[PDB]
A paper describes a structure:
Proliferation and transmission of these obligate endoparasites in their host organisms rely on efficient cell invasion. MLC1 (in P. falciparum: myosin A tail-interacting protein, MTIP) binds at the very C-terminus of MyoA, while ELC is expected to interact with the C-terminus of MyoA upstream of MLC115. We demonstrate that ELCs bind to a conserved binding site on MyoA to induce its α-helical secondary structure and stiffen the MyoA neck.
To investigate whether the homologous complexes from T. gondii and P. falciparum are structurally similar, we determined the crystal structure of the P. falciparum trimeric complex (PfMyoA, MTIP, PfELC) at 2.5 Å resolution. Overall, this structure resembles a similar fold and conformation compared to the T. gondii trimeric complexes, with the typical MyoA helix kink of 131° between the MTIP and PfELC binding sites. While the secondary structure elements are maintained, the position of the PfELC helices differ. The N-terminal lobe of PfELC aligns well to TgELCs structures (backbone RMSD of 2.5 Å to TgELC1), but the C-terminal lobe adopts a different orientation with respect to the MyoA helix (backbone RMSD of 3.5 Å to TgELC1), resulting in a reduced number of polar interactions between PfELC and PfMyoA. This explains the lower binding affinity of trimeric complex formation in P. falciparum. Of note, the electron density of the PfELC C-terminal lobe is less well defined compared to the remaining structure, which is likely caused by increased flexibility of the C-terminal loop of PfELC. This is also reflected in the comparison of the calculated scattering data from the P. falciparum complex structure and the recorded SAXS data with Χ2 = 3.9. Contrary to T. gondii TgELCs, the homologous EF hand loop of PfELC (in isolation or in complex) is bent to the other side and does not possess the residues needed for coordination of calcium.
Numbering used by the authors:
A (entry chain A): 0 to 134
B (entry chain B): 65 to 204
C (entry chain C): 774 to 816
The structure:
Amino acid sequence: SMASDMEEKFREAFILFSSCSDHIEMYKFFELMNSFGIILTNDEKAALPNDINMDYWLNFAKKHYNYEQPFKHINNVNEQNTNVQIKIDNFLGIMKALDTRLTESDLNILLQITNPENKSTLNLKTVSQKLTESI
Amino acid sequence: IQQLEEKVDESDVRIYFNEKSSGGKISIDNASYNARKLGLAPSSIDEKKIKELYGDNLTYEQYLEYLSICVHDKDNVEELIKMFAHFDNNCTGYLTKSQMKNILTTWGDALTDQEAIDALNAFSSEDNIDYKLFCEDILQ
Amino acid sequence: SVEWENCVSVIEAAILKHKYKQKVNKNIPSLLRVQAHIRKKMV
């Protein structure tokens, strides 16, 4: 099933973000779920256990993942700012402005998955499509 | 190749083929079984290389070629531990059985949970595994 | 904007996961040799 075929990628990602531990630190669990486009409300966060293991993650992921639009939250800004070809510079400006953990080198990896070589026009619907393709 | 003739028993090459051949040909799966019985260690890379050349079913000569690319002379403890070293977070040179099981079953030519837990129980009865020693044991 | 904060959270995290994945891929050739020798030991 869509769910069972994701379980491989969910297991891989828990191992990568926990550095192959049994239990994953909370700040790392937020990155882990965000990496598959999942965002909770503060009320859902309050119900999370502090001791998170692989099995919790796998049930959490199978329920909260959006099978049809994994990166909906990227295209939900399109309701705010409609599909526009942001300048490669203007898009870097939007990223470094909002507090971000991604370096210019990490920005190049983002450019390396999304542009790929056009180096001209980038709409948020390609970057969501490119990022789903590389799951 | 002079590296093959030196490492494997030449009579056991002929015989293992006869043990598994059919219509003058041996299946890649069987050639890999023979390679392991001879003390070689093919990967999926070695199976993909011979399949691109000859297909699923090997003549005796095609089978001798497959055994020559399965030699992998460069393999030592330094080259095997790279993935365990990556995930060793305490710099102790040990990983738990769960950690090794997850590493062996997630990536590459993944083992099944059983194949992995069997290989690890065969090496040690203790939860902490000296990954350098584990790689020494499977190499010899 | 919460919609913007959401959008960057998911992009940063998806790049992080890509970096972690491309660093374990560097180690897979090695891991195939571990798996190969295990399959040989246990034949």
